[PDB]
Design a protein around this ligand. Structure first.
Ligand SMILES: Cc1cc(NC(=O)CCC(=O)c2ccc(F)c(C(F)(F)F)c2)ccc1-c1nn(C(C)C)c2ncnc(N)c12
Ligand SMILES: [Cl-]
Ligand SMILES: [Cl-]
Ligand SMILES: [Cl-]
Length: 256
């Protein structure tokens, strides 16, 4: 029992491939939220309508302060609407390009929030695909939120080798994801960035990257342990949260 006339639409927060995201206020309650608009024909011409459905299905069952809330959804004749938690402080992507790179304390805190969220997802038998900084939003107290759905049960920069090599993948993709982001947070660009898709593919498959001099031994150690070609050599999240560099630098308590 939901419709577009139920919401006052504010400014565009952002414009995406399959549609746009708007600030919105629910009329009866005055609840401020983010309304994401998707056009059916687009999703269909891309054949991802079913996948969207599955991801939204899995999202509904996810309650965690570091995961964007999905309040509900509906559709008219031509569009699909996702009613989402409004994240007032924008994306990590935008923060990174304003600050150039993050210090070790912001980085370890962000990694901790992600590991906690992912750890909660793992317990619910949920794993995440690609994790990109444009898909990490910031709450009012600047807490990080995983904002893209899917959730299992484009640029290659954030894909693990097993995914680009066409091998079997599991929850270990999440550990790779933390490794890539930890590096990007500290350095200001992901560790396999390149001018072409072709070069990036090679560099990921090879795990061919280097650290700038300013990256500390503690951070190199964590990143080197996450970015293992063999998914089975990657640590458990439980061990990311107890890493001495994480422990020494992060403001956020581990797990729960
Ligand atoms: C980043 C962000 C994400 C989301 N949720 C999604 O995007 C889920 C959709 C999805 O995963 C999907 C879509 C199509 C598709 F085909 C498939 C497939 F094929 F895989 F099935 C999957 C809602 C709001 C925002 C958001 N963005 N922003 C910026 C504009 C600052 C914001 N500023 C403030 N508050 C905000 N909430 C936001
Ligand atoms: Cl070569
Ligand atoms: Cl080379
Ligand atoms: Cl070479």
């Amino acid at each position: 029992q939901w419709a577009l006339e139920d919401f006052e639409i504010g400014r565009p927060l952002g414009k995406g491939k399959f549609g746009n995201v708007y600030l919105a206020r629910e009329k009866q309650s005055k609840f401020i939220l983010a309304l994401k608009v998707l056009f059916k024909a687009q999703l269909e011409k891309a054949g991802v309508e079913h996948q969207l459905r599955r991801e939204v299905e899995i999202q509904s069952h996810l309650r965690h302060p570091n995961i964007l809330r999905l309040y509900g959804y509906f559709h008219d004749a031509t569009r699909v609407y996702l009613i989402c938690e409004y994240a007032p402080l924008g994306t990590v992507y935008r923060e990174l390009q304003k600050l150039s790179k993050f210090d070790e304390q912001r980085t370890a805190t962000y990694i901790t929030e992600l590991a906690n969220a992912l750890s909660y997802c793992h317990s619910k038998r949920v794993i995440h695909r690609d994790i990109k900084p444009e898909n990490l939003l910031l709450g009012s107290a600047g807490e990080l939120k995983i904002a893209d759905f899917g959730w299992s049960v484009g640029t290659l920069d954030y894909l693990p080798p097993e995914m680009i090599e066409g091998r079997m993948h599991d929850e270990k993709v999440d550990l790779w994801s933390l490794g890539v982001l930890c590096y990007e947070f500290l350095v200001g660009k992901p560790p396999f960035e390149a001018n072409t898709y072709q070069e990036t593919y090679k560099r990921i498959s090879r795990v061919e990257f280097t650290f700038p001099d300013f990256v500390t031994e503690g951070a190199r150690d964590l990143i080197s342990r996450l970015l293992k070609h063999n998914p089975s050599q990657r640590p458990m999240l439980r061990e990311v949260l107890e890493h001495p560099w994480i422990t020494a630098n992060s403001s956020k308590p581990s797990n729960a």
